Amino acid sequence: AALKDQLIVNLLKEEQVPQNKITVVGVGAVGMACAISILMKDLADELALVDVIEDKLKGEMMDLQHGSLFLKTPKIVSSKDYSVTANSKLVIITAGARQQEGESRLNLVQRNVNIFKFIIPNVVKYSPQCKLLIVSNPVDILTYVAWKISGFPKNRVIGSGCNLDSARFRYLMGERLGVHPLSCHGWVLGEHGDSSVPVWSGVNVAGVSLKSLNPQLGTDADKEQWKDVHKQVVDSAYEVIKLKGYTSWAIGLSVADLAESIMKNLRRVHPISTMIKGLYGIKEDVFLSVPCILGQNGISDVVKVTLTPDEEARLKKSADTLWGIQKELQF
Amino acid sequence: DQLIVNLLKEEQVPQNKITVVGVGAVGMACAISILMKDLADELALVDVIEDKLKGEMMDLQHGSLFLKTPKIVSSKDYSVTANSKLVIITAGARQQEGESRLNLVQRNVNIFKFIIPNVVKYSPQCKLLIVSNPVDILTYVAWKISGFPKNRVIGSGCNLDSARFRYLMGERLGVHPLSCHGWVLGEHGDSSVPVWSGVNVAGVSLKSLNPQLGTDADKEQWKDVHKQVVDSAYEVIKLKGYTSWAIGLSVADLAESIMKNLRRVHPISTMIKGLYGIKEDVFLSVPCILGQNGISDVVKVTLTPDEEARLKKSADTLWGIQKELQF
Amino acid sequence: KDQLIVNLLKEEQVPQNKITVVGVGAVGMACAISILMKDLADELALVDVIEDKLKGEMMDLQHGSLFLKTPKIVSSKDYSVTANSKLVIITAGARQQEGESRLNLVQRNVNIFKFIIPNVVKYSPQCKLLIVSNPVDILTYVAWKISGFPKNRVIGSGCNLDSARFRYLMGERLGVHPLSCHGWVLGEHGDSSVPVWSGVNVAGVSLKSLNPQLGTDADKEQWKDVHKQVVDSAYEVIKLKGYTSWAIGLSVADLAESIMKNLRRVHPISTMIKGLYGIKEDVFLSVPCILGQNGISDVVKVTLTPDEEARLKKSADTLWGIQKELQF
Amino acid sequence: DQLIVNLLKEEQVPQNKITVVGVGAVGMACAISILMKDLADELALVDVIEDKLKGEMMDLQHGSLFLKTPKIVSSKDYSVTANSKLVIITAGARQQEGESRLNLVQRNVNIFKFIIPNVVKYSPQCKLLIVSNPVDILTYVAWKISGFPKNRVIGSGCNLDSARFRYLMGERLGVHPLSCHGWVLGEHGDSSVPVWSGVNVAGVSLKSLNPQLGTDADKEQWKDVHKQVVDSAYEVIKLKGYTSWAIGLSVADLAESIMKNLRRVHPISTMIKGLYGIKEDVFLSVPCILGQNGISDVVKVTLTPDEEARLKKSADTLWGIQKELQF
C-alpha cells in the first residue's frame, strides 16, 4: 500500500529460501506442546504446522502468531497441504490414530499405516533432505514404518524412544536424593514403555555408581527398592492420563531437547530409538533406544553399553516381538 | 546417605515463587511460559479439580530435567501458595446464556470471596495479577476483597490486545512487531481504544504521513486492524474452541517485568481514579511502569476528545456495575 | 575409542550457522563472547595476524565449551578457517599515529582491507559483511568497494551503539527501562551524529509534543546534553579504562541476532544511502534499516527538519571528500 | 513530570543482587557472563583503582538496552554492595618472582582483612564465592575472617579444571562435553586428582573398557588429558598473557546454581574436615550440592589408596601454610 511506501523504501527483492525451518505434523496436545517448546527455545526461523482438521489447524496457528511479539521466530505458517513444509531441516511426526482400549499394537500400527502412507511421501517430497523425528505411539514400530515408507537412510529417521522415560527416571532419582535431575544419571533403554530396561550399572551421581555402594541395586533384595523407580517410569503415562486424560508438557519438552541437538549440531548423547540391526545381538530391521550421538545429520554414532545377560536377553526379546509384529504389516 | 553426606540442617524458604490459580488452558499456558523463561525458583498450582490439578503438576514435573525451576507443587489448599512474590488468577465463572452481566460479575465476586482472602493469608506481600475475564472489573473486585494497595493489584488488561495490534501492524509493513509500536488502551475487549497518534516505526508517526489514519476516511482503513484485534479472541475460539498460547506468553512477559524489576512500560489495567477525567475507583489499561512493587508510575497519554470520551464512557459502565455488587 | 563408540555414518560436517570474527582485540573478543552466550552460531571462527594471542584466545573460549551451545570454535591466520560463514564481522584495522594525516590512516586501512576482504569473499562468497572497524562509515564503504558485494550485504555497525547509549541515558533520566525509551541517533557515528528529537518518545507520547524546545539551547530540561554525552561516551570510557569493549560487543551481537534469525527488526546501522535522504554520493550513513537474513532489505524514511537534512548532507560531503582520494 | 505521573513512593531494595570484587580480566569476565545469563536484578562492582572501576561500569551500563539487569553500580566504598545475595571475590595479589608461597598467601590475607569485613558489614547474609588464587587456601582465609558458617563460603576450586577435562574428553571422543563425564578433585592446579573410576559416557565407565586407564601403561594415554588440564592456564597465559573467558563462564555457572537454588553437583572447594581422612580445617574440591544456602551436602567419592593419599598430601601442605598465617 501507499502508506507503507511513504514509510519504507524497499531496496531488495528477496526470495523465501527458508534456513532453519521446523515442521510439526499434528496439532493435537502433543504436537502443540512440541510447538510451544520449540518456539520458546529459539530453535527455528520458520515453524510450519500440518494437520487434516482445518479449523483446529488454523486456530492454533493464529493463537501462536498472536504471541509473536514475545518470540524470536518470525514466520509461523500452517496448511493441510504439505507444500507449506518445503525445505524443513527437521519434520516432527505426532499424528496418528490413538490406541483404543484392548487394541493390540499390531492393529493400531496397521490403522496408522494408511495415515503414514499419505504423510511420509508428502514430507519426503517437499523436504527430501530433512531429518524425520517420530513421536507417535507406539514409537519404535512407527519409526520403522516411517523409515520403510520414506526410503531415507537410517541416520535420518529417529524415534523419540526412551528420551522421556530416562528424563522421568532422572526426575524421580533426583527427588529421592535431593539433587537436581541434571546431576542425577541413569539410562532407560530398549522398547519405549512397559518393556524398557533400567541399566542399573550406569546409575550414578558425580561418577559414583549407586550399585558400587548398593550391590543389590534394582533387584528384589534391594533395601531401598530402586526397582520401584523404574516401575513409576513405566506407569507414568497411565498415571497422568488417569488424572488429566492425556500427557503433553513433558513429551513436548523432551522433543524440543532432541530438536535442539539436531538444529545446533550439538552431538549430545540421547536415549532415542534407532535402527540397531547388527548391534547388541539384533539380526532384524528393528528400532530400539540406545545412547545415540545426535547432530545435524541425525544419528551418526552409538555408545556400546555393556549389558548383563538379563539385560541383553530383555533387549533381544523386544526385538523379536517387534519383528514379529512388523512382518505382519500390510504396506 | 552412604552416597550423599548432609552437612546442613537447612530449611527451604522460597525466594522467587509464583502461584497460578486455575489450571484451565489459560493457566497452564501461563505456567509453561513462566517455566520456559526461568522466572521462578518455585511454581505453585491451585484449582478445585484435584485430579486434573495433580495430573498437570505431574506432567510438568516429568519435564524438570529440561527446566531450571527446581520445585513444582500443587494443591486445592492455598497453604501450598505460601510466600509467593506473584499470584496469577485465571479462575472464574463463565457467562450462562440469558444471564446478565452484573449477575455474572456477582457470581465472580462470590468465587473471589473464597480465592482472594486465601491468597492474601499465605502471601500477604505478593503482587496480584488478574487474568480472569472480564478483566477490568474483576481486577477491581480482587482489589476490594484483598485490601491491598492499588500498586499491587494488576489486571492483564490490553497487554495482549496491544501485542495483537503490533502483530497485525507488522504484517502490513513487513517489519518485526518488536519494531512496530502502537497502543490499545481502555477497557479490554470491544470498547478498547487504539491510540492512532502513537502508532509509529522508528519514531516516525504513521498519522503524520496519513492524517486520516484510523478514521472512516482512511484510504487504507487501518481501523480494520483494531477491529481484527477486537474480534481476535472470537475468531480463535470459533476455530479451536479457546485461546491459550498468546495470553500465556503475554502474562509471562508481565511476570518477567515484575520478578526482574525491569520497569518496562505495558498497557495493563490499573486503578486510574484521578487521571483521564475518571472520578470513581475503576481499573482501565494505560501505559504502566511495571516492577518489583507492581505499578509505580503511569505514562500520561495525550488523548483526543473522542478518545477521552470513550475512556470516560467505559469507566461509567464499569462503575455502574460495580456499585450494585454485594461484597 | 572404538570399543566405546561405534560409528554408523561417514559424514562430512558442513556448518549451517557459522560466524567469523576478524580481529581478536578487545572489541573482537567482546563480539565473540556475546555471540557465544546468545547461542547464535553452530561454529565460531577467529582470524588475526598475531598468531600467539589468537591461539590463546581460541583456547580460552574452548575451555568454556561445557557452559556453551556452540560446538566448534576454530582459529587461524589463514582465512580457509572461515569457509562457509553466514556472517563475517570485521574489527581489525590500523590506528592513527602521531603526525599521520586522516587520509593516510584511512589509506592504511584500505591496504589492510585489500588483503582481508578478498580472502573473506574467497571462502564465504554468500556471507553478509558487518564492519565494526573505525572509522566505521568510511571503512564500510572500503569493504563494499573491495568485496564487490551488493549493498544489502555490507553493513556498518554505525550508530547502533550510539542509539543504545542515548536510550540508556534517556531511561536513567525517566526511571524507565531503556527497552521502553525510544530515540534515534543517525548519520555519522561519533562526533557528527544527529539526534532526531521529533522521534524521542515513551509509549508513543512524543516528548517534543510536550516540550516544544526539546533538544535546543532553550530547552529547560537540557536534553541536548544527553546527545552531548552520547558523543563524548567513547572518550570518557577510553580516558577511564583505556578502550571500550562490552557495549559495542553487545550491540554487534544484537545485529548478529537479527541477521542469523531473519528477524527484520529495525536498527540504526550504516547502509549505502546513495539516492536516498537527498544524498548523491556512494557513502554509508546510519538510518533505521530493516535487518534480516539477506542483510539490509529496506530503509525507514525519517521525516527530517531542514537542520537535520543539512547535517546528513554535510556528513556525506565530508565522507566523500576522503573517499575520492583513496587508492584502491 | 508531564510525561510520567508518579503513583507510589517506593524505597526500592534489591532482591537478587550480586557483587563482583575486582575488575581485572577475571572479574569483568565474571560480570559479563552473569549479565548475559540474567542472574541478577542488580550488579555491583568494587575495586581500589577508581578510574578503571568507573570506566568498566560505564561500558557495561551502555549495553543496558541489550540486557535484563536494570541496575549496574560501582564504587571503591563497600556500601555500594549492601544486600547482596552473592559476593564474588576475584581481587588479590600475584606471586612475584622469588617470592615465597607463604609470603604470597600472607599478602593476600592482608588484602582480605580489608575486603572481607567490609563485605560482611553490608551483606551479613550473603554467600561468598572466592575466585582469587590460590583458591583453596584463600577460601579458608575468607572463611576465617568472615566468621561465616562453612556452607556460605565457597571456593571456585576445580570447577574449571573439570570443565577443561570434559572439553578435552569430548574432543577425543567426538561428543559434546555435556555428555562426557569426569571429575577433577582436590587442590586446584598442579596437584589436582582425576578420578579415573568416574570417567564415563552414558554411564559406561571407560575404565571398565580399559582397565589401564590413566596409568603409564594406558595405550590411549588418558593421563595426558589431566596433564593438559594442569598445563592449561600456563599455556594460555603464555599465548595471551592471562586467562579470563573460561573462568568467567565457570563462575557464572556456580552463581546460577546458587541464585536459582538448583542443587546441581559441582566440583568446588569446601571445608572437608571430617571426610577423606582429613582432620584439619582445609578447603578442597569434592562434588558439592550447591543451592540458595551454599554448600549443603557432599557426594562421597570412593577414592583408591593412591587417590586418598594425594588428597591427604594436599591437606597437609594447606594446613602447613595456614598454620603460619598472621590474622
Residue numbers in the entry:
A (entry chain C): 1 to 331
B (entry chain B), D (entry chain D): 5 to 331
C (entry chain A): 4 to 331
Share the article's original sentences.
LDHA (also known as LDH-M and LDH-5) is a homotetrameric enzyme that catalyzes the cytosolic conversion of pyruvate to lactate in the final step of glycolysis, oxidizing nicotinamide adenine dinucleotide (NADH) in the process. Elevated LDHA levels are integrally associated with many cancer types and it appears likely to be a principal factor in the altered metabolisms required for the growth and proliferation of certain tumors. These observations have highlighted LDHA as an attractive target for new anti-cancer agents for use against glycolytic tumors. Considering extremely high sequence identity between the human and rat LDHA sequences (94% identity), the fact that the cofactor and substrate binding sites are identical, and recent structural work from the literature with the rat homologue, we developed a very efficient, automated purification protocol for the production of milligram quantities of very pure, untagged rat LDHA (rLDHA), as an alternative to the human protein, from E. coli, using the ÄKTAxpress™ chromatography system.
We next embarked on development of a robust protein crystallisation rationale for use in soaking and co-crystallisation of fragments and small molecules for development of inhibitors for LDHA. Upon close inspection both tetramers appeared in a ‘fully open’ conformation (all subunits in the tetramer adopting an open conformation with respect to the active site loop) despite the presence of electron density in the lactate binding site. Oxamate was therefore modelled in to the density present in each of the 8 subunits in the assymetric unit. This is in excellent agreement with theoretical molecular weight of 145.6 kDa. for tetrameric rLDHA (monomer = 36.4 kDa.). All of these data illustrate the very high quality of the purified protein and the robustness of the methodology for the production of very pure, mono-disperse, tetrameric rLDHA.
